[PDB]
Structure 1
Amino acid sequence: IESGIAHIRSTFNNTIVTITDTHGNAISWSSAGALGFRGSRKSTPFAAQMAAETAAKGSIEHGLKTLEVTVKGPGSGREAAIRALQAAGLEVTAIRDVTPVPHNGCRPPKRRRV
């Protein structure tokens, strides 16, 4: 194939990266536990460095070149996929910070020390 977009979710634990179609259909995906970062090493920028490259190898298997990266969530891997996937020979076109922003939503859980 030729074109697709790239979803990245970089939470406090995981850096989950999927390469999907432009109209939302998956091709390849990986994360830190997919490579073998077993513990709480999953949030490191080295983990998103390794995880984005392995998913991009499945894109070369399907030959798509153009990307469209949507960053979702607070973490550390939002810079690493820019460092990885641009160096992966793939065309990074647009970068969004689409965190799903609630207006008020539902009430969050308690603070961790109450």
Structure 2
Amino acid sequence: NIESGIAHIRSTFNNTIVTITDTHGNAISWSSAGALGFRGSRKSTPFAAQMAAETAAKGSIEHGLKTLEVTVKGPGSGREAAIRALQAAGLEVTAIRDVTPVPHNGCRPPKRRRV
């Protein structure tokens, strides 16, 4: 029953993560995009981000979690709503991380969709 923990913001066009883990990155409860029986486009809404974040928060409160250190890693779709949901309990976002390649074209990305 651990006091402190982490969550991990990493946002794209329509993908975001924020799982509830311990200080050393051992998991406890998890939040990332959906998880909650939502499907399709509803899954990527800001609303559905809240309900995923609440459900992982209320999972971790039962493990005696009081505070959540969260990261920063660019803007995206439903990142702000996911934080608002977590501020039911209350917490901080101190760290700032990144998912970027130090080469433009480190690995070659997949081809542009013709739509």
TM-score bracket, normalised by the shorter chain, equals 0.7 to 0.9
72 and 102 in structure 1: CA distance in 2 versus 1, 3 angstrom threshold: farther
Match of 2:10, SS?
strand
Per-residue deviation, residues 34-70 of structure 1 (Å, max 9, x unmatched): 2111112121110111110000011111111121112
Determine the structure 1 residue equivalent to 2:108: 107
TM-score (norm 2): 0.76
User: Equivalents in 2 of 1:78, 1:21: separation in Å?
Assistant: 20
Contact 1:17/1:51 (8 A) holds in 2: no
| Deviating more after overlay: 49-58 vs 14-23 | 14-23
User: Equivalents in 2 of 1:98, 1:22: separation in Å?
Assistant: 20
42 and 101 in structure 1: CA distance in 2 versus 1, 3 angstrom threshold: farther
Contact 1:11/1:43 (8 A) holds in 2: no
Contact 2:69/2:91 (8 A) holds in 1: no
Consecutive unaligned residues in structure 2, runs of 5 or more: none
TM-score (norm 1): 0.77
48 and 99 in structure 1: CA distance in 2 versus 1, 3 angstrom threshold: farther
1:24-103 correspondence to structure 2 within 5 Å: 24-72=25-73, 75-94=76-95, 103=104
Contact 2:9/2:17 (8 A) holds in 1: yes
- Compare the two structures and name the one with the higher strand fraction: 1
User: Equivalents in 2 of 1:62, 1:111: separation in Å?
Assistant: 44
- Compare the two structures and name the one with the higher helix fraction: 1
